[PDB]
Structures are given as structure tokens and as C-alpha cells.
């Protein structure tokens, strides 16, 4: 019941690239979700200690959050757009796994997920 270390946000060994799709993911997709009213629960990694959820990291073995995703884009962690899209999807999947239907957190996640899918459908053409 101690928090795990947050996911890695910068790796010296990995090669670094800037693409329009990556610009769009940080600049449009991340920013739109970050500004949203329901954003706060997904803005940082779930703090199991502070929120007193002992079972959360036993159930969820691949934690992800928008704060982490924002840092990865900002640190040029992702070579590919799909890597970032996968992280968004993992964050939503985690919420649904841990939480029951009708929970406030699940409803918020669905709204964010819905908006995310709309923006991702507008993803710019790759190089
Ligand atoms: C049962 C919901 C728990 C949860 C959050 C969450 O963030 N909930 C939260 C609740 C209360 C306050 C704050 S908080 O942001 O205001 N806050 C101040 C309090 C103590 C430190 C923490 C930060 C955050 N997000 C996800 C994805 C989940 C789960 C389990 O799926």
C-alpha cells in the first residue's frame, strides 16, 4: 500500500523526433481534454496512499494518466503517435477495470473518452 513510482517520462537512450501528429496530440488532443471540467481525476497518477485505495495497484498493473502523457509529449518520449494513443486508451481502460458502472469517475471517463475519440478522428496526415 505504498505508491508505485510514476511511469517513466524521459529516456536518454530512446531516439527523439518531432511530427505533426505528435504536435496535434499535445497541442490539440491533450489540451482539449486537460481543459475539460472532468479532467482533474486523470490529471495526475492515482495516489492510492492519499485516496486510501489499498487494492488499486494490485488490480491495475499498467498505470497511466494525462499528467504523465503530457510530460512524455513535452519530453519527446514518443517516436510514434500510436504510442501516445495507447497511453490515453490504457488510462481509460484502467478506469473501467477498477470502477463499476454508474460510478461518478466512470461517467467522467466516458465523457473524456468520447471527446478524445472525436479529436483523434481528426488526426493530421503522417509524414
Ligand atoms: C475513486 C476515484 C479515484 C481516482 C482518481 C482521482 O483522482 N480521484 C480523486 C478523488 C478526490 C480528490 C482528488 S484530488 O485530485 O483532488 N487530489 C487531492 C486529494 C489527495 C491527493 C490526490 C489528488 C482526486 N482518478 C482516477 C483515475 C481514480 C480511479 C480510482 O479510477
Coordinates of C-alpha atoms and ligand atoms in Angstrom, one line a residue:
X1 CA 0.0 0.0 0.0
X2 CA 2.8 2.4 -0.9
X3 CA 2.5 4.2 -4.2
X4 CA 4.4 2.8 -7.2
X5 CA 6.9 5.1 -8.9
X6 CA 5.2 7.1 -11.7
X7 CA 5.6 5.9 -15.2
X8 CA 8.9 7.0 -16.9
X9 CA 8.5 10.4 -18.7
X10 CA 12.0 10.8 -20.3
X11 CA 14.5 8.3 -21.6
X12 CA 18.1 9.3 -22.7
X13 CA 18.5 6.1 -24.6
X14 CA 15.5 6.5 -26.9
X15 CA 15.8 8.5 -30.2
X16 CA 13.8 11.7 -30.5
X17 CA 11.5 13.1 -33.2
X18 CA 9.0 15.9 -33.9
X19 CA 6.0 15.1 -36.1
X20 CA 2.8 17.0 -36.9
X21 CA 0.7 14.1 -35.4
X22 CA 2.8 14.5 -32.2
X23 CA 2.2 18.3 -32.2
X24 CA -1.5 17.6 -32.7
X25 CA -1.6 15.1 -29.8
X26 CA -0.1 17.5 -27.3
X27 CA -1.4 20.8 -28.8
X28 CA -5.0 19.7 -29.5
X29 CA -6.0 16.3 -28.1
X30 CA -4.2 16.7 -24.7
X31 CA -5.0 20.3 -24.3
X32 CA -8.7 19.9 -25.1
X33 CA -9.0 17.0 -22.5
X34 CA -6.8 18.9 -20.0
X35 CA -9.1 22.0 -20.0
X36 CA -12.2 19.8 -19.6
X37 CA -14.4 20.0 -16.4
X38 CA -13.9 16.3 -15.7
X39 CA -10.1 16.5 -16.2
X40 CA -8.9 16.7 -12.6
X41 CA -9.2 13.0 -11.7
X42 CA -7.0 12.0 -14.6
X43 CA -4.5 14.9 -14.4
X44 CA -2.0 13.1 -12.2
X45 CA -1.2 9.4 -11.4
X46 CA -3.8 7.9 -9.0
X47 CA -2.5 8.5 -5.4
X48 CA -3.6 5.3 -3.7
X49 CA -2.0 6.4 -0.4
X50 CA -3.7 9.7 -0.2
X51 CA -7.0 8.4 -1.6
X52 CA -6.7 5.4 0.7
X53 CA -7.3 2.7 -2.0
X54 CA -5.1 -0.2 -1.0
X55 CA -6.2 -2.6 -3.8
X56 CA -5.8 -0.1 -6.8
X57 CA -2.3 -1.0 -7.8
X58 CA -2.9 -4.7 -7.2
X59 CA -5.7 -4.5 -9.8
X60 CA -4.0 -2.1 -12.1
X61 CA -0.5 -3.1 -13.3
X62 CA -0.2 -0.6 -16.1
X63 CA -1.0 2.8 -14.6
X64 CA -1.3 5.8 -17.0
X65 CA -2.5 9.4 -16.6
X66 CA -2.7 12.6 -18.6
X67 CA -0.1 14.3 -16.5
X68 CA 2.3 11.5 -17.4
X69 CA 1.2 11.7 -21.1
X70 CA 1.7 15.5 -21.1
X71 CA 5.3 15.1 -19.8
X72 CA 6.1 12.4 -22.4
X73 CA 5.0 14.6 -25.3
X74 CA 6.8 17.5 -23.8
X75 CA 10.0 15.5 -23.3
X76 CA 9.7 13.9 -26.8
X77 CA 9.3 10.4 -25.3
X78 CA 7.0 9.1 -28.1
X79 CA 8.5 8.4 -31.5
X80 CA 5.1 7.3 -32.8
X81 CA 1.6 8.7 -32.5
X82 CA 0.1 5.3 -31.6
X83 CA 2.4 5.1 -28.5
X84 CA 0.7 8.2 -27.2
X85 CA -2.8 7.0 -28.3
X86 CA -2.2 3.7 -26.5
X87 CA -1.4 5.6 -23.3
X88 CA -4.7 7.5 -23.5
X89 CA -6.5 4.2 -24.1
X90 CA -4.7 2.5 -21.2
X91 CA -5.8 5.3 -18.8
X92 CA -9.5 4.9 -19.8
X93 CA -9.3 1.1 -19.7
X94 CA -7.8 1.3 -16.2
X95 CA -10.8 3.4 -15.0
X96 CA -13.3 1.0 -16.4
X97 CA -11.5 -2.1 -15.0
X98 CA -11.3 -0.7 -11.4
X99 CA -14.6 1.1 -11.3
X100 CA -18.3 -0.1 -11.6
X101 CA -20.9 1.3 -14.0
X102 CA -22.7 4.4 -12.6
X103 CA -19.6 5.5 -10.6
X104 CA -19.0 9.2 -11.0
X105 CA -15.4 8.5 -12.1
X106 CA -16.6 6.2 -14.9
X107 CA -19.1 8.7 -16.2
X108 CA -16.4 11.3 -16.3
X109 CA -14.0 8.9 -18.1
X110 CA -16.7 8.2 -20.7
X111 CA -17.2 11.9 -21.4
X112 CA -13.4 12.4 -21.8
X113 CA -13.0 9.3 -23.8
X114 CA -15.8 10.4 -26.2
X115 CA -14.2 13.8 -26.7
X116 CA -10.8 12.1 -27.2
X117 CA -12.1 9.8 -29.9
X118 CA -13.6 12.8 -31.8
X119 CA -10.3 14.6 -31.7
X120 CA -8.3 11.5 -32.6
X121 CA -10.6 11.0 -35.6
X122 CA -9.3 14.4 -36.8
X123 CA -5.6 13.4 -36.6
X124 CA -3.4 15.1 -39.2
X125 CA -1.7 13.2 -42.0
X126 CA 1.6 11.5 -41.1
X127 CA 4.9 12.2 -42.8
Ligands
LIG1 C1 -12.2 6.9 -6.6 C2 -11.6 7.9 -7.6 C3 -10.0 7.8 -7.5 C4 -9.5 8.1 -8.9 C5 -9.0 9.4 -9.4 C6 -8.9 10.7 -8.5 O1 -8.0 11.5 -8.9 N1 -9.7 10.9 -7.5 C7 -9.6 12.0 -6.7 C8 -10.6 12.0 -5.6 C9 -10.6 13.0 -4.7 C10 -9.6 14.1 -4.8 C11 -8.7 14.1 -5.8 S1 -7.7 15.3 -5.9 O2 -7.2 15.4 -7.3 O3 -8.4 16.5 -5.6 N2 -6.4 15.1 -5.0 C12 -6.4 15.7 -3.7 C13 -6.7 14.5 -2.7 C14 -5.4 13.9 -2.3 C15 -4.3 13.8 -3.3 C16 -4.9 13.3 -4.7 C17 -5.3 14.5 -5.6 C18 -8.7 13.0 -6.8 N3 -8.6 9.3 -10.6 C19 -8.8 8.1 -11.1 C20 -8.4 7.6 -12.5 C21 -9.4 7.3 -10.0 C22 -9.7 5.8 -10.1 C23 -9.7 5.0 -8.8 O4 -10.0 5.3 -11.1

